[PDB]
Ligand binder design. Structure first.
Ligand SMILES: [Ca+2]
Ligand SMILES: [Ca+2]
Ligand SMILES: [Ca+2]
Ligand SMILES: [Ca+2]
Ligand SMILES: [Ca+2]
Ligand SMILES: [Ca+2]
Length: 300
């Protein structure tokens, strides 16, 4: 009718082996038998058992702190003669038994213009770890593919990773990244999960046409429609940012010459001076418009 103690307490690690003895209830007057009362939860009765004779409570099931960190058992001491009851309080401590998992709201493929300023945010990732304290805090890093330190990841709220431009980008040097984002917990030792973020670098019109002849063109013609010279230029950008237009902008007031806008070929017009100094402008078709100038000196 009386118990060895006012209540019983035990502190156990989650995932403790089945059969582990956690506490012994003892009552005294007649044989005494021990059992859980009717009100003790189904969840608790699946995890713990009490020996009818000894009063020893053992681990019966898989104790998972992420499913519950505290149980109240009520134990009946039946002398076969209402029976006395006593409370048993079980605290469950944390194992670092979970790795971070990325949420599906995490960016996995982004497009960044190569003139994206240092400090601008280009992506966010989110990860969770259901362990307790340090075992559940998440910190992000860029473990590989972060060529020349282009990007940096900053962690908020042990939960969100913000990806920023850390160094100026240049599509003409590197037009894509495969960043291996790592979510680590702060367990000792830590558990980690990786996530791939693909970065495509978009072109800006940041390269001018470059004239292939550094000193311009010096030519003699002795012609109606006779080709005189082809001006050529290149451009390091792509798409419309490297599509070139060729114009004669000065020295052709008497209309002796024609320049094909696309090919840069100069011809005499179908149709007087012994000498012409043509100025040629080459423009790309991007924004802002970039251009180069060259000189074409024509002797007839
Ligand atoms: Ca667990
Ligand atoms: Ca963890
Ligand atoms: Ca845990
Ligand atoms: Ca560039
Ligand atoms: Ca460019
Ligand atoms: Ca260009």
């Amino acid at each position: 009718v009386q118990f060895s103690n006012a209540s019983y307490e035990a502190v156990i690690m989650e995932n403790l082996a089945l059969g582990t003895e956690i506490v012994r209830v003892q009552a005294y007057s007649n044989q005494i038998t021990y059992r859980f009362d009717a009100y003790t939860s189904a969840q608790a009765k699946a995890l713990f058992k009490i020996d009818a004779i000894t009063g020893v409570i053992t681990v019966k099931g898989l104790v998972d702190r992420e499913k519950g960190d505290f149980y109240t058992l009520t134990v009946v001491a039946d002398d076969g003669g209402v029976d006395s009851t006593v409370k048993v309080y079980i605290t469950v401590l944390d194992e670092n038994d979970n790795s971070p998992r990325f949420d599906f709201t995490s960016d996995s493929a982004i497009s960044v213009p190569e003139d994206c300023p240092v400090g601008q945010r280009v992506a966010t990732v989110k990860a969770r770890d259901p362990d307790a304290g340090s075992n559940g805090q998440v910190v992000f890093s860029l473990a590989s593919g972060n060529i020349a330190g282009a990007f940096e990841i900053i962690t908020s709220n042990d939960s969100i990773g913000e990806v920023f431009v850390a160094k100026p980008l240049d599509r003409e040097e590197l037009d894509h990244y495969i960043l291996k984002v790592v979510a680590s917990d702060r367990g000792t030792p830590p558990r980690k999960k990786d996530h791939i973020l693909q970065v495509t670098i978009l072109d800006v019109n940041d390269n001018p046409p470059v004239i292939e002849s550094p000193f311009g063109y010096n030519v003699s013609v002795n012609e109606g429609g006779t080709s005189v010279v082809q001006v050529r230029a290149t451009d390091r950008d792509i798409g419309i940012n490297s599509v070139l237009s060729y114009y004669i902008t000065e020295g052709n007031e008497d209309m002796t010459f024609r320049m094909d806008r696309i090919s840069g070929e100069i011809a005499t017009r179908p149709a007087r001076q012994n000498f012409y100094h043509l100025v040629v402008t080459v423009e790309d078709e991007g924004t802002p418009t970039l251009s180069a100038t060259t000189h074409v000196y024509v002797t007839i």
